[PDB]
Amino acid sequence: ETPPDLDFRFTGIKQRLIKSENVKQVTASWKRLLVEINKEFTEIAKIGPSYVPKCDFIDIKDNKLPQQVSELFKQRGCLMIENVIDVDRIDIWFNELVEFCKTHPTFPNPTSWYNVFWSKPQTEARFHPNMKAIFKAMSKEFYVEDKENCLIDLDTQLVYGDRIRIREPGKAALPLHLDSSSIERWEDIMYSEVYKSIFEGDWENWDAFKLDERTYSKENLYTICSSFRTLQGWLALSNNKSGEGTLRVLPSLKLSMAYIMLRPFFWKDPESGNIDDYEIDLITPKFPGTVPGTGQLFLDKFYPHLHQGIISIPDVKKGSFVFWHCDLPHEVDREHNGNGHSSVLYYGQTPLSITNIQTLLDTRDAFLKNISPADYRSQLNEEEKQKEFQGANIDDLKNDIDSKRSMGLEEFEKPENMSGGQAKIRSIANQALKSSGFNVDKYIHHAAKLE
């Protein structure tokens, strides 16, 4: 009923985040927020899955989302793109994955997750021209203002190795949450600056797509994903109707994060039910749904105003791609009472950026050694480590130079004309590929001082 206390240091986190002079404004903003939430989340609940933005791969011209799709995607924080990959190609990839899993050990496994990272179908999927295209189009929804200095190149996609899911009917399920850290959004300096507009009482002007500060955020100050992903995503390897062992989302990005970020300050709902009776809590170290040191923020217990907004995604067809913003609440369906396997291949957007240089190095090292990337490799014992085989084949990259750069296998080109942070991050990556090591702290410390 009451969220637990964390250590009392978290009280000083609260007093760092909201300035005394802004307390009145923040309180007013929380009341405005709840009124908007009840209106908009009601509409979502009454519309259902068609609320999620959806478009056809052919609608993407010149590697840009059309204007109407863009506008809906920035509001709703998720998108389903249909017909990215032909069904026949999808079938071949699915069958090759299953073969690989059956020849490289129980099948089906208990959890519906298969720790295969570098198989040929994965490498081919990741680098299919239609897949590169949709990532290019997504990358144009994000931006930075300080182009001269911010160490990010949104024109470059890196590979973060991830696994596959093949969920049989009857396999039950991990509640509503955010990934990309449990407590960091509040605790880290640069991460919390992402949400400054909310902490100042102006949630309405929070821009989820501006990356100047997030570029330097530490998602792990201490279940953990080691890369900075702007978007989570996956490619559909099966046809499954809404609710059949798929994904559920809360398709309202700004309202979601205004509520989440302020919830530690307004965690006590009043007995009156009158929104005008909330009052700020700047004292208790309560950060509901958090477990410092873990990767997920849980929303299933102390975030009740969110629940009305949760919907299944639209019917999924083979060869559709589904994206959601790193800040979008989501969960998987509890049950799968559909007619066949619900299977996806996970692939997120991971820009070339200062907090992703370690990822670039891990990907290069794991693929070259045919082992798990670090986030999974670190959970294996000595025997498992010596046994695993990941299907990595340089030739699956089809000697495409751009693909090899995504995998950390080739230095980045820096054209005569290119400058600013884009040129600089490419150079820093190249230096790391030459030396084989990197230390992020210097860059982070400099960004935070510059504050």
Q: Which residues of this protein are in contact with Fe ion, per CB under 5 A?
A: 179
Site of tokens 């991830």:
162
* Shortest reach from residue 28's CB to Fe ion, in Å: 33
Residue count of the chain, please give it.
451
CA distance to 143, 151, 189, 307, 419, per residue, from 146 (Å): 9, 9, 18, 37, 12
Q: Quick one: 187 or 327, whose CB is closer to Fe ion? A: 327
Q: Quick one: 178 or 425, whose CB is closer to Fe ion? A: 178
* Shortest reach from residue 119's CB to Fe ion, in Å: 22
* Shortest reach from residue 250's CB to Fe ion, in Å: 12
Q: Six-digit token pair at 133?
A: 């295209």
* Shortest reach from residue 286's CB to Fe ion, in Å: 23
Annotated binding site: 177, 179, 330
Q: What is the DSSP string of 22-80?
A: GHHHHHHHHHHHHHHHHHHHHHHHHH-GGGS-EEEGGG-BTTB--HHHHHHHHHH-EEE
Q: Quick one: 77 or 421, whose CB is closer to Fe ion? A: 77
CA distance to 6, 295, 403, 426, per residue, from 158 (Å): 36, 21, 9, 12
Q: Quick one: 234 or 287, whose CB is closer to Fe ion? A: 234
Annotated binding site for Fe(3+): 177, 179, 330
DSSP code of 326?
A: T
Q: Quick one: 179 or 212, whose CB is closer to Fe ion? A: 179
Cβ pair 219, 300 in contact under 8 A: no
Site of tokens 């498992």:
384
What distance in Å separates the CA atoms of residue 107 and residue 341, rounded to the nearest whole number? 13
> Amino acid letter at 80?
M
Residue of closest CB approach to Fe ion:
179
Q: Quick one: 179 or 184, whose CB is closer to Fe ion? A: 179
Question: Under 8 Å CB-to-CB from 124, ≥6 apart: which residues?
Answer: 93, 396
* Shortest reach from residue 332's CB to Fe ion, in Å: 8
* Shortest reach from residue 291's CB to Fe ion, in Å: 15
